[PDB]
Amino acid sequence: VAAVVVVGSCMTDLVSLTSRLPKTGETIHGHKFFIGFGGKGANQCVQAARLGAMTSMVCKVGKDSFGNDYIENLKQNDISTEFTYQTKDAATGTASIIVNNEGQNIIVIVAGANLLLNTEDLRAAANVISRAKVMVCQLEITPATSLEALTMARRSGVKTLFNPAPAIADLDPQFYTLSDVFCCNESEAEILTGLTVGSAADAGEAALVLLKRGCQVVIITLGAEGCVVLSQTEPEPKHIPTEKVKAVDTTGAGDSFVGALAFYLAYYPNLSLEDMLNRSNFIAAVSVQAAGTQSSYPYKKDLPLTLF
Amino acid sequence: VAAVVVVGSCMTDLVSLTSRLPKTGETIHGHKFFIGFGGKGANQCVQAARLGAMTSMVCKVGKDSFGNDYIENLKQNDISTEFTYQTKDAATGTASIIVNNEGQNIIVIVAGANLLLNTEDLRAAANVISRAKVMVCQLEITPATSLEALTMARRSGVKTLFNPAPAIADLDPQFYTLSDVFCCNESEAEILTGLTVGSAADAGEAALVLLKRGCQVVIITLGAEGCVVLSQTEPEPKHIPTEKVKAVDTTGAGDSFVGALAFYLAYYPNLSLEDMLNRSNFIAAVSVQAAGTQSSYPYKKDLPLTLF
């Protein structure tokens, strides 16, 4: 049985490294190209799986080499692919990433087959969804499918962890009321609330707006400043610092955070949220010290015994 | 285009020969003074260059005569000096060496300009670093600078060869996780692990402690006993013996070994690690048969065709 079910996105990262980003109209030469496995859904599922969670990825890829490789990536990470669909109607979702020597990038995301994960694909997963402890969603598939995933879990008493990423300014009100744990970053919080979030006190203000909209728990991640959390039971914001560490590559750090939190929500329910968030901050602080997104997500074996 | 990029130290050896060593407060007269070229980084880079490698030395010397001389020493070794910086704020790195008839010595090393190589200098060197096949670093510049160089290489998919020399007891944990090949000698391994490392058996235990810290490959050099190698994909220590030879001067044999290893990592990447280390042993073994450190490093010209 999958304890953590993620309903969300799989994307092939297509990365070109250059000395400079190109300008409009120009063709430039880069020095290296490589492929990575990305997508917030898959990233979150991968971190939870490596921590030890029995996971299942509900998603859609293309009946192409990219999709075949993504399925094998999930299998290699011991993630169930029972409800990883393949479609001939769209290519596997893609992120064309151009990165210069300063780490500055330009990214073009084509959602592709991710947008074809539909409500019937979800209903076929009804039995896995109802036996899970945690249901994780984001906003890189059709919102209607994420909303239906949240409803099914909620109807079977499964804990919902929703990550409104990328953030939509007019996010449907029902997302908030279907979220047990609503987790986003400073930029998404700005988009969702219209407030400027450049400190932990600003994040506390923005978290209360998100909490008034119906979330049970709100977490706003703050990069190196850690995170701030509010709930319906303790609505006073509390800042939870993270480990002061030298960052090698912060890409996918939030996905490591969310995947870690999923694991603690499903396997350590009798821990306090503040403790779960301390541990999730730590795991995420470890991923920021390595390169390559999913390549940077640590295993249970390589973490202190004190986190389990 | 440089396949081997060495980010590290250059130092001017200021050698005085005497009959006896001086005691506190004593002025003695010596019989000869001469200048030599040293620094682990330059040593390594010279050996890789002599083997045929297209190399570049990212380093900082003084805007003084020692620095201009160092630049010409590098040029005379067919090394690119496009990233050899000069500074008005410190003297070129120096080793002041007094040697007596008995062969005893006192050495005073002043890092000097080496410690002023900063992250802006690395940022200006970013294209050469990211376009390399291997990036080599040691611990004779500011450790933060070496860590940032390893970070850049790793992010660009460039092979990192780290030589923690001279060794430091509380080496930042990221030095291990950012090292693809982590190479040191016996006494460096003893400093880094707190174990006795006298024999190949001892080196096996020590290399294992290092591999569990995050290294992909650990090599411990063992003088006349050659070296020991472990890896993530082969956690079992293997012993590569060297040539039994009549040593005349083993000074800088480690740097010969490392420069040779960088050459094979960059130009022969499909060779087995064992094959590379046996060739690198042979090369370091040739260096041991003459005096003069960089002076003893052999050329592709003067070596067996079977090494290539």
Ligand SMILES: Nc1ncnc2c1ncn2[C@@H]1O[C@H](COP(=O)(O)OP(=O)(O)O)[C@@H](O)[C@H]1O
């Ligand atoms: N420099 C850093 N040092 C320590 N932890 C970090 C650092 N950057 C990110 N983190 C950790 O990763 C989590 C998510 O980071 P953040 O950048 O806010 O998310 P996202 O990746 O969604 O932008 C943070 O809450 C924190 O625990």
Ligand SMILES: Nc1ncnc2c1ncn2[C@@H]1O[C@H](COP(=O)(O)OP(=O)(O)O)[C@@H](O)[C@H]1O
């Ligand atoms: N007497 C020797 N005979 C043959 N090879 C030697 C001898 N001394 C050193 N070497 C070679 O040089 C390499 C580095 O030597 P070592 O003394 O361990 O390094 P360091 O210069 O860091 O002290 C060894 O692995 C070996 O291949």
Ligand SMILES: [Mg+2]
């Ligand atoms: Mg995120």
Ligand SMILES: [Mg+2]
């Ligand atoms: Mg050495």
Ligand code: NA
């Ligand atoms: Na990372």
Ligand code: NA
């Ligand atoms: Na020698």
